[PDB]
Design an enzyme around this catalytic site. Structure first.
Site, PDB file in Angstrom:
ATOM      1  N   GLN C  11       0.823  -1.206   0.000  1.00  0.00           N
ATOM      2  CA  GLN C  11       0.000   0.000   0.000  1.00  0.00           C
ATOM      3  C   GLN C  11       0.857   1.256   0.000  1.00  0.00           C
ATOM      4  OE1 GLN C  11      -2.314   0.578   3.522  1.00  0.00           O
ATOM      5  NE2 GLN C  11      -3.735   2.025   2.565  1.00  0.00           N
ATOM      6  N   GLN C  15       0.650   3.840  -3.234  1.00  0.00           N
ATOM      7  CA  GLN C  15       0.273   5.224  -2.967  1.00  0.00           C
ATOM      8  C   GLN C  15       1.411   6.188  -3.280  1.00  0.00           C
ATOM      9  OE1 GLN C  15      -1.130   5.023   1.036  1.00  0.00           O
ATOM     10  NE2 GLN C  15      -3.199   4.406   0.435  1.00  0.00           N
ATOM     11  N   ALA C  99      -1.697  -9.188   4.321  1.00  0.00           N
ATOM     12  CA  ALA C  99      -0.650  -9.797   5.129  1.00  0.00           C
ATOM     13  C   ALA C  99      -0.849  -9.619   6.625  1.00  0.00           C
ATOM     14  CB  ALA C  99       0.726  -9.238   4.744  1.00  0.00           C
ATOM     15  N   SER C 140       7.847   0.021   2.296  1.00  0.00           N
ATOM     16  CA  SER C 140       7.905   0.576   3.641  1.00  0.00           C
ATOM     17  C   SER C 140       8.215  -0.531   4.636  1.00  0.00           C
ATOM     18  CB  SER C 140       6.593   1.251   4.024  1.00  0.00           C
ATOM     19  OG  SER C 140       5.520   0.337   3.931  1.00  0.00           O
ATOM     20  N   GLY C 144       3.359  -5.579   6.402  1.00  0.00           N
ATOM     21  CA  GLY C 144       3.691  -6.962   6.119  1.00  0.00           C
ATOM     22  C   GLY C 144       4.044  -7.248   4.674  1.00  0.00           C
ATOM     23  N   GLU C 183       5.753  -3.011  14.921  1.00  0.00           N
ATOM     24  CA  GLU C 183       6.621  -2.300  13.983  1.00  0.00           C
ATOM     25  C   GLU C 183       8.122  -2.494  14.212  1.00  0.00           C
ATOM     26  OE1 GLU C 183       4.941   1.341  13.013  1.00  0.00           O
ATOM     27  OE2 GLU C 183       6.356   1.772  11.401  1.00  0.00           O
ATOM     28  N   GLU C 254      27.018   5.164 -11.409  1.00  0.00           N
ATOM     29  CA  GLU C 254      28.105   6.081 -11.086  1.00  0.00           C
ATOM     30  C   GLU C 254      28.039   6.535  -9.633  1.00  0.00           C
ATOM     31  OE1 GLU C 254      29.955   8.895 -13.430  1.00  0.00           O
ATOM     32  OE2 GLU C 254      29.091   8.271 -15.346  1.00  0.00           O
TER      33      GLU C 254
HETATM   34  N1  LIG Z   1       5.884   7.843   3.570  1.00  0.00           N
HETATM   35  C1  LIG Z   1       4.693   7.260   3.504  1.00  0.00           C
HETATM   36  N2  LIG Z   1       4.437   6.149   4.275  1.00  0.00           N
HETATM   37  C2  LIG Z   1       3.231   5.542   4.218  1.00  0.00           C
HETATM   38  C3  LIG Z   1       2.237   6.027   3.389  1.00  0.00           C
HETATM   39  N3  LIG Z   1       1.154   5.236   3.540  1.00  0.00           N
HETATM   40  C4  LIG Z   1       1.445   4.265   4.438  1.00  0.00           C
HETATM   41  N4  LIG Z   1       2.727   4.454   4.876  1.00  0.00           N
HETATM   42  C5  LIG Z   1       3.489   3.635   5.835  1.00  0.00           C
HETATM   43  O1  LIG Z   1       3.187   2.266   5.664  1.00  0.00           O
HETATM   44  C6  LIG Z   1       3.365   1.605   6.896  1.00  0.00           C
HETATM   45  C7  LIG Z   1       2.517   0.343   6.974  1.00  0.00           C
HETATM   46  O2  LIG Z   1       2.396  -0.274   5.711  1.00  0.00           O
HETATM   47  P1  LIG Z   1       0.956  -0.290   5.000  1.00  0.00           P
HETATM   48  O3  LIG Z   1       0.491   1.114   4.712  1.00  0.00           O
HETATM   49  O4  LIG Z   1      -0.033  -0.999   5.885  1.00  0.00           O
HETATM   50  O5  LIG Z   1       1.157  -1.102   3.630  1.00  0.00           O
HETATM   51  P2  LIG Z   1       1.999  -2.466   3.589  1.00  0.00           P
HETATM   52  O6  LIG Z   1       3.462  -2.160   3.771  1.00  0.00           O
HETATM   53  O7  LIG Z   1       1.773  -3.165   2.275  1.00  0.00           O
HETATM   54  O8  LIG Z   1       1.439  -3.380   4.791  1.00  0.00           O
HETATM   55  P3  LIG Z   1       0.086  -4.249   4.700  1.00  0.00           P
HETATM   56  O9  LIG Z   1      -1.111  -3.340   4.668  1.00  0.00           O
HETATM   57  O10 LIG Z   1      -0.004  -5.147   5.906  1.00  0.00           O
HETATM   58  O11 LIG Z   1       0.097  -5.102   3.459  1.00  0.00           O
HETATM   59  C8  LIG Z   1       2.982   2.624   7.953  1.00  0.00           C
HETATM   60  O12 LIG Z   1       3.853   2.525   9.052  1.00  0.00           O
HETATM   61  C9  LIG Z   1       3.166   3.966   7.280  1.00  0.00           C
HETATM   62  O13 LIG Z   1       4.260   4.624   7.863  1.00  0.00           O
HETATM   63  C10 LIG Z   1       2.487   7.147   2.610  1.00  0.00           C
HETATM   64  O14 LIG Z   1       1.614   7.591   1.870  1.00  0.00           O
HETATM   65  N5  LIG Z   1       3.718   7.762   2.670  1.00  0.00           N
HETATM   66 MG   LIG Z   2      -2.856  -2.875   3.780  1.00  0.00          MG
END
Ligand SMILES: Nc1nc2c(ncn2[C@@H]2O[C@H](COP(=O)(O)OP(=O)(O)OP(=O)(O)O)[C@@H](O)[C@H]2O)c(=O)[nH]1
Ligand SMILES: [Mg+2]
Ligand SMILES: Nc1nc2c(ncn2[C@@H]2O[C@H](COP(=O)(O)OP(=O)(O)O)[C@@H](O)[C@H]2O)c(=O)[nH]1
Lengths: 220, 186, 439, 437, 31
Positions: C11, C15, C99, C140, C144, C183, C254
């Site tokens: 996600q 995004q 996940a 990120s 998961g 986390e 580079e």
């Molecule tokens: N920088 C940034 N971090 C984001 C954004 N949206 C979500 N996050 C980060 O994503 C982390 C968690 O991951 P998720 O948003 O749930 O997406 P995922 O990594 O696929 O995890 P799952 O939903 O379990 O599949 C959070 O701790 C947020 O910090 C964003 O738009 N910008």
């Molecule tokens: Mg999700």
């Protein structure tokens, strides 16, 4: 001072009072037991024999032919006594009956769980050490006794989880009181490995379900 | 520390029998404990390190972070007890190229990894009391292919019972060991 | 000819990915439906779009992106939104029952059903490439899917592809604010299986971008849209030397060579300058010396760690716009004279400079205003030794009581893989203090 | 894509779930007839999470109504939204339980569960990929609890790798309208502690307190009580049916909130609640939602959170809002109230944000706190059980139906072990020293 | 036809229409 989750807590300089202590480690007051009232009435065929070597209970009748259905739940009910004449008849009578038991210890085990749990729920350190010495001795009494405690891990072990972490931290000081074996957290690890070795195949997953920080001793 | 001293045969940097065994070792304990208790098998005092977390509880030599041992002897030998819980130990060497390396021996790792700063290898601990013999000279010529000069730090982590960590100039057999160094089982 | 394949996973990958491709279309004058306009030309038509696009002979452009997720809630916004027609339908890859913020579920149970389907679409995107520069991965550390499946996404990209560059654009968990409880457990286990399979790994955390968006952009209430617009500007400036001609162009291989001292140390800090809003953009005369001082200023970093606490290893400055090589070399010499910015003694030629010609492009509805020049800095400091020293505490603060371990263990993970990944991080903390110590 | 089958047991369960189905039919834009009359495309995007498509553009709920008295389901079907249920989904006994857990578990309950599980199998095997099951019941009666515990214990055996939510209206001290209530409660928590993935504890006393001194209702009937429970039920799973900036479904909430497999009893709350007179005068933003959801009078259980320590907190916001405020306010709450949160878990609060607000509101928030103050709710039931069981009152009405006296003591012992483990996880330090002195 | 193939959302009366592709069944469902 202030209580939490108020507008008085959300100030720039306020002081918040914490929650009161629950009391998971404080000693609980005891209650009258059934061992005292059955010894004073006179049903037990026991007598304290003052020997030169030490103190040993003398039995008027043989220990093999005793009715273990009526006495084994009763003698475990004396584990909550701390005054002298009852605490010695309790633990020393327990060990001799477990020693000369034989085949009849296994059917009494469903009736023994309730006085086992109530002995550990006093949160008194002296009772906990003596009760844990019995639990190590109980599992090695016969062959099929060890595999029967596996359904009853959910009632004994939640108090063993509390006191597993306590141990001495004298970084180079020698422990001169090893003979008395008062370290509860040393006994709990010693007790839990005896449960797993004699428990069978499914013994490890049941102990780790109740005691979270466990590590298997039989498995490598 | 031991640059000025004589270095031949054995060098002993720990012993569980003495007034202050941990005089030069720095004791860092967190969610753990250290004590000294009588063993059940050898009827002699052993050191104790325990803890639910392996990483936080350790003892390091020397105590000062800036100071180094500087031991020229090749083989490091330890006498420790297997308890079937997680256990690690480090040794830090100095190669020919004057770059400090590491050798981490975990009994739970299955993969062997090599890297210029740290090379981690597995270990299998036999039950009962057993003696670990380490080869600092060959493991530097195998992982990096450089020579061996000196050894600086040794750390012993959680869940072990330690007695007589000692160096050697080669691997003597049990017959050639003196009375003090061999483990005497009844 | 120089071609890259973006792999947005999770996600946070999607995004962020929607912010990048909205930016990449506007740099090349491509409409949302895929085709450049016939009545208008936005920029001279070149082969510059070939780094991220593939041109069907009818005149359509398809991105070289593979959107990866385990739940359908966020992919169907791509399949319904404005850019529904830009992406090929089989690129958008969607699983079932996500996940659940569980690294073991996204590695051992759920991800093994989708691993073969994603790697087949990766093949058909890299087979069309006449020469591949390397993939880009957006993920990120918190969740998961972005932590578990990404851990073994690169394990199969390393076996199949020998030494192709695989860059990371990670979201480090913030020291104080965090949207999860497990986390610390995800980020310890992620780095253990990513220190070996990643060629570079830039980090930005959400707390520092929150502070920059409030003091510099004057946004009182930032959202996740305003954060992803800043990350898209950094990834554009990295690849702006790949697409457009410049005075000093820097390829991906580079600055990959010219930032990492040792194989374990590939964690740069990304800062961007200037980040100023539309009311203050036209009153300030932003010279080359003005915008290169804001990178070294410790409040403008995008990672919550203070560079004054450590020593710099190497730097990579990327200037775009109306800049000349004289004003760059004058401004760097000013930084070297100061006694507070400190460089390691075994790196005298500490800087690397890249100059491009095309200025940054503003997006409609965005917050930043269009400026004539900008700079992106990828520094390498010893001040990243304190980001994990907090996170090694947070991992050890829960793991001594074995909280939440009963979830990860039941999906296929052993007990020792939590501890053997903790030892892999304590080896890294000692690794920097011996690198940073003087001779 | 992820389907949930609703199951409801007893009179309390039927009333609560009827209100819930009316509420989320209003949310998804469905008339009392059953058809779709809406003005958005996001309502129908994910409607297969709860509904099942029929012929002619109709949607029927995926609900199963189990009961031991047909008059209650007659009242359910004769309601406003009672004609949308398929008539095959009602499963009734012929004789009532009689507020007897023994009758609802052993004697009369075993003749209905085969017919119930036929419908459960039929309605759960016709899905694409099942998420889990949901149950609403109360621990005071015989039909809701005695049948409900056995139903959970069979559904878990049939489908182990699924999620299981339950909403238990556990008994309250000062409101109790059943003499034999603590017997049923003590024998029901014994099954809910072992066979359930998540349990939400709701108290009628706290529902009265919230509905009176916050909502300012002169006549809080059971419709106005069940509105609160339905709103909480909608807010828990809105992240599964509506797209959001940061989303978290049932499995994610369970994974991040439940630290240990025996500790899954949660306290709910709702955030923008206010009276009709003061609704127009009140400006609602993220600080107001945070203050009202963390306020101790707003808990939907009769347990003061100041008596213990929060183990893990989650908040599910609904509406269009900025993430900086959401993170900042609940960082500030943790920083100010430092002693009421456990010190061996850092950043105890999980956040989720959903885009689409509820009907008639522009912003809302739902609170789910896993606190330690449930120890008093267990000890009160334990002492009320022991006081009655020591003199053995009302015991023949259970032991003439095929039970032993040992099971009551076993249930009491199990629930006291549960109390002891909340006590150890309350009084636990980050460093295992300073406790044993 | 405002969605692309692979769309996992619900489209009314799309299960009854058979032997056509996604765009065709969506057009016949909307019409
Ligand atoms: N920088 C940034 N971090 C984001 C954004 N949206 C979500 N996050 C980060 O994503 C982390 C968690 O991951 P998720 O948003 O749930 O997406 P995922 O990594 O696929 O995890 P799952 O939903 O379990 O599949 C959070 O701790 C947020 O910090 C964003 O738009 N910008
Ligand atoms: Mg999700
Ligand atoms: N919150 C709430 N509680 C209810 C409702 N109806 C009944 N109760 C409570 O449930 C208890 C009786 O349980 P009961 O309905 O007989 O359970 P049953 O045997 O399964 O029908 C009473 O003490 C009521 O307080 C309702 O609509 N809402």
């Amino acid at each position: 001072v202030s209580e939490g989750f108020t507008v008085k807590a959300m100030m720039k300089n306020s002081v918040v009072r914490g929650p009161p202590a629950a009391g998971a480690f404080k000693e609980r007051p005891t209650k009258p037991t059934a061992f005292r009232k059955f010894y004073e009435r006179g049903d037990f065929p026991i007598a304290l024999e003052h020997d030169s070597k030490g103190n040993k209970i003398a039995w008027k009748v043989e220990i093999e032919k005793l009715d273990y259905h009526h006495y084994l739940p009763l003698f475990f009910d004396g584990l909550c006594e701390m005054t002298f004449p009852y605490e010695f008849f309790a633990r020393q009578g327990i060990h001799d009956m477990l020693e000369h038991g034989g085949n009849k210890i296994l059917p009494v085990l469903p009736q023994l769980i309730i006085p086992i749990k109530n002995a550990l729920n006093l949160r008194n350190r002296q009772v906990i050490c003596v009760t844990l010495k019995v639990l190590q001795h109980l599992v090695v009494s016969a062959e099929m006794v060890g595999k029967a405690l596996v359904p009853y891990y959910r009632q004994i072990l939640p108090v063993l989880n509390i006191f597993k972490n306590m141990n001495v931290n004298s970084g180079d000081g020698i422990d001169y009181s090893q003979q008395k074996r008062e370290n509860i957290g040393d006994l709990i690890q010693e007790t839990l490995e005896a449960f797993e070795r004699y428990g069978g195949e499914n013994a490890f997953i049941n102990i780790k379900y109740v005691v979270p920080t466990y590590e298997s001793c039989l498995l490598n | 520390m031991f640059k000025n001293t004589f270095q031949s045969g054995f060098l002993s940097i720990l012993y569980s029998i003495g007034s202050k065994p941990l005089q030069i070792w720095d004791k860092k304990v967190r969610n753990g404990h250290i004590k000294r208790i009588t063993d059940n098998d050898i009827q002699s005092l052993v050191l104790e390190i325990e803890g639910t977390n392996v990483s936080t509880t350790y003892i390091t030599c020397p105590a000062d972070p800036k100071k180094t041992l500087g031991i020229k002897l090749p083989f490091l030998v330890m006498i420790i007890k297997n308890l079937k819980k997680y256990f690690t130990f480090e040794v830090q060497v100095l190669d020919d190229k004057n770059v400090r390396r590491r050798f981490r021996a975990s009994n739970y790792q299955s993969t062997t990894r090599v890297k210029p700063f740290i090379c981690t290898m597995p270990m299998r601990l036999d039950d009962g009391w057993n003696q670990i013999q380490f080869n600092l000279l060959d493991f530097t010529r195998r992982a990096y292919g450089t020579n061996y000069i000196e050894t600086l730090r040794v750390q012993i982590h959680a869940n072990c019972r330690i007695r007589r960590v000692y160096f050697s100039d080669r691997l003597y057999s049990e017959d050639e060991l003196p009375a003090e160094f061999k483990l005497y089982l009844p | 000819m120089r071609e890259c394949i973006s792999i947005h996973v999770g996600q946070a990958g999607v995004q962020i990915g929607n912010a990048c491709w909205e930016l990449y279309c506007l740099e090349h004058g491509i409409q949302p439906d895929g085709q450049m306009p016939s009545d208008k030309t936005i920029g001279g038509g070149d082969d510059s779009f070939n780094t991220f696009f593939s041109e069907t002979g009818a005149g359509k452009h398809v991105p070289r992106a593979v959107f990866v997720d385990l739940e359908p809630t966020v992919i169907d916004e791509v399949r319904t939104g404005t850019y529904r027609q830009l992406f090929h339908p089989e690129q958008l890859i969607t699983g079932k029952e996500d996940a659940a913020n569980n690294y073991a579920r996204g590695h051992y149970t759920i991800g093994k059903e989708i691993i073969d389907l994603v790697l087949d679409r990766i093949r058909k995107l890299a087979d069309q490439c006449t020469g591949l520069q390397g993939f880009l991965v957006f993920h990120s550390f918190g969740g998961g899917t972005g932590s578990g499946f990404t851990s073994l996404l690169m394990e199969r990209l390393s076996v199949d592809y020998g030494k192709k560059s695989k860059l990371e654009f990670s979201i480090y968990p913030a020291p104080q604010v965090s949207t999860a409880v497990v986390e610390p457990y995800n980020s310890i286990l992620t780095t253990h299986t990513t220190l070996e399979h990643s060629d570079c790994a830039f980090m930005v955390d959400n707390e520092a971008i929150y502070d920059i968006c409030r003091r510099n952009l004057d946004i009182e209430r930032p959202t996740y849209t305003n954060l992803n617009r800043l990350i898209g500007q950094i990834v554009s400036s990295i690849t702006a030397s790949l697409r457009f001609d410049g005075a000093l162009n820097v390829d991906l291989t580079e600055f990959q060579t010219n930032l990492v001292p040792y194989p374990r140390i590939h964690f740069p800090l990304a800062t961007y300058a200037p980040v100023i809003s539309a009311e203050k953009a036209y009153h300030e005369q932003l010279s080359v010396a003005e915008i290169t001082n804001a990178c070294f200023e410790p409040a403008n970093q995008m990672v919550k760690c203070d560079p004054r606490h450590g020593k710099y290893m190497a730097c990579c400055l990327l200037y775009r716009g109306d800049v000349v090589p004289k004003d760059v070399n004058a401004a760097i010499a000013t930084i070297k004279t100061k006694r507070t910015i400190q460089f390691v003694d075994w790196c005298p030629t500490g800087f690397k400079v890249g100059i491009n010609y095309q200025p940054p492009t503003v997006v409609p509805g965005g917050d930043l205003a269009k400026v004539q020049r900008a700079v992106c800095m990828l520094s390498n400091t010893t001040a990243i030794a304190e980001a994990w020293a907090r996170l090694d505490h947070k991992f050890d603060l829960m793991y001594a009581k074995r909280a939440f371990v009963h979830w990860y263990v039941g999906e296929g993970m052993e007990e020792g893989e939590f501890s053997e990944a903790r030892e892999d991080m304590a080896a890294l903390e000692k690794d920097y203090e011996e690198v940073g110590v003087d001779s | 894509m992820r389907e949930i089958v609703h199951l409801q047991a007893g009179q309390c369960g039927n009333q609560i779930g009827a209100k819930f189905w009316e509420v989320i039919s209003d949310e998804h834009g469905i008339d009392p007839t059953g058809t779709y009359h809406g003005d958005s495309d996001l309502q129908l995007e994910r409607i297969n999470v709860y509904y099942n498509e029929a012929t002619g553009g109709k949607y029927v709920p995926r609900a199963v109504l189990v009961d031991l008295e047909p008059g209650t389901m007659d009242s359910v079907r004769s309601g406003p939204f009672g004609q949308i249920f398929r008539p095959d989904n009602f499963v009734f006994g012929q004789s009532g339980a009689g507020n007897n857990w023994a009758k609802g578990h052993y004697t009369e309950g075993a003749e209905l569960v085969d017919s119930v599980l036929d419908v459960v199998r039929k309605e759960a095997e016709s899905c694409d990929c099942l998420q889990g099951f949901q149950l609403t019941h109360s621990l005071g009666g015989g039909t809701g609890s005695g049948m409900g515990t056995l139903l959970i214990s069979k559904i878990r055996e049939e489908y182990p790798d699924r999620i299981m939510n339950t909403f238990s209206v556990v008994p309250s001290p000062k409101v109790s309208d059943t003499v034999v209530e603590p017997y049923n409660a003590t024998l029901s928590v014994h099954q809910l502690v072992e066979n359930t993935d998540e349990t939400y504890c709701i108290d009628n006393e706290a529902l009265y307190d919230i509905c009176f001194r916050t909502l300012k209702l002169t006549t809080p009937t059971y419709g106005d009580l069940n509105h609160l429970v339905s709103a909480t039920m909608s807010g828990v799973t809105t992240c599964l049916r509506f797209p959001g900036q940061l989303n978290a479904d049932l499995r994610k909430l369970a994974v991040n909130m439940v630290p240990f497999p025996r500790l899954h009893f949660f306290m709910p709350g709702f955030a923008p609640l206010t009276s009709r007179g003061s609704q127009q005068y009140r400006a609602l933003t993220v600080p107001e939602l945070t203050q009202q959801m963390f306020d101790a009078k707003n808990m939907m259980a009769a347990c003061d959170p100041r008596h213990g320590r929060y183990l893990t907190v989650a908040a599910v916001f609904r509406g269009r809002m900025s993430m900086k405020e959401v993170d900042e306010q609940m960082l500030n709450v943790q920083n100010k109230n430092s002693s009421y949160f456990v010190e061996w878990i850092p950043n105890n609060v999980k956040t989720a944000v959903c885009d689409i607000p509820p009907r008639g509101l522009k912003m809302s928030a739902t609170f789910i706190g896993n606190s330690t103050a449930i120890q008093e709710l267990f000890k009160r039931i334990s002492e009320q059980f022991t006081a009655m069981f020591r003199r053995k009152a009302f015991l023949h009405w259970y032991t003439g139906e095929g039970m032993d006296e040992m099971e009551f003591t076993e249930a009491e012992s199990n629930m006291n072990d549960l109390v002891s483990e909340y006590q150890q996880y309350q009084d636990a330090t980050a460093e295992e020293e300073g406790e044993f002195e | 036809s405002s969605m692309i193939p692979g769309y996992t959302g619900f489209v009314p009366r799309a299960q009854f229409i058979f032997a056509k592709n996604c765009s065709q069944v969506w057009a016949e469902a909307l019409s």
